[PDB]
């Protein structure tokens, strides 16, 4: 009984009935949280946190910052339910039946006596192996800092 499915069904409903910009912002948070939680379990815990620190902590509270400076103004129920029920029939984004319905395993090895976190490897590669990517990204962030001022600052 995967309770993750129910939450998305709710979000798949309020997205269709969203009326004002309050609803759309709440869609973003209600999309991030199923992303963050399903990543905290299952695949990668490091990036479940890296989402919260950057997505919610930087952009989403900047979404609601600007939205307060924008505006605040202002089929039925059977069609919305019918749309969801037909949309819910197929939910296999892939079509490799063998790859979906067969489970696998990996065999652990004791060679890596130097156990380290996944972030240490990323730092060990992003700062040495792919330093150019890091230095270009710094350059892009420099462009934005100069870019954001010129657009907004009237003088």
């Amino acid at each position: 009984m995967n309770l993750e499915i129910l939450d998305l069904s709710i979000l798949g409903f309020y997205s269709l009935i969203s009326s004002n910009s309050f609803e759309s912002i709440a869609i973003l948070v209600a999309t991030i949280m199923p992303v963050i939680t399903e990543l905290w379990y299952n695949y990668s815990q490091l990036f479940a946190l890296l989402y919260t620190l950057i997505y919610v902590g930087a952009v989403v509270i900047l979404f609601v910052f600007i939205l307060s400076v924008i505006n605040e103004k202002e089929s039925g129920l059977f069609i919305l339910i019918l749309v969801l029920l037909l949309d819910d029939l197929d939910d296999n984004e892939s079509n490799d039946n063998d790859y979906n319905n067969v489970y696998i395993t990996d065999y652990a090895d004791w060679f890596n006596n130097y156990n380290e976190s996944d972030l240490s490897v990323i730092g060990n590669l992003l700062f040495t192996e792919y330093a150019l990517l890091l230095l270009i990204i710094s350059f892009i962030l420099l462009m934005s800092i100069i870019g954001l001022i010129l657009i907004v600052k009237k003088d």
């Binding site: 060679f111 890596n112 006596n113 130097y114």
Partner: protein, 78 residues
């Protein structure tokens, strides 16, 4: 020159003092950050007068002896 803004290519010492009295948050911020590279470039003085570097950590798997297998190895058999 009662309170004139110092010229940076004429009075380097007095130009520093202007930004040390009137903009304290800028002058002393850079100075703390300046010690970073300054101490980094002073490392070759430490490698000869204070102590020598440690040996690198064995983070490359099991150290494999640079030889061939020993045929004569026996014992602990079946």
């Amino acid at each position: 020159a009662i309170g004139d803004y110092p010229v940076y290519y004429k009075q380097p010492i007095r130009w520093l003092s202007y930004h040390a009295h009137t903009r304290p948050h800028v002058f002393y911020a850079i100075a703390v950050a300046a010690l970073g590279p300054v101490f980094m470039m002073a490392t070759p003085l430490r490698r000869k007068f204070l102590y020598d570097d440690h040996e690198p950590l064995p983070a490359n798997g099991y150290p494999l002896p640079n030889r061939s297998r020993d045929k004569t190895l026996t014992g602990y058999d079946d």
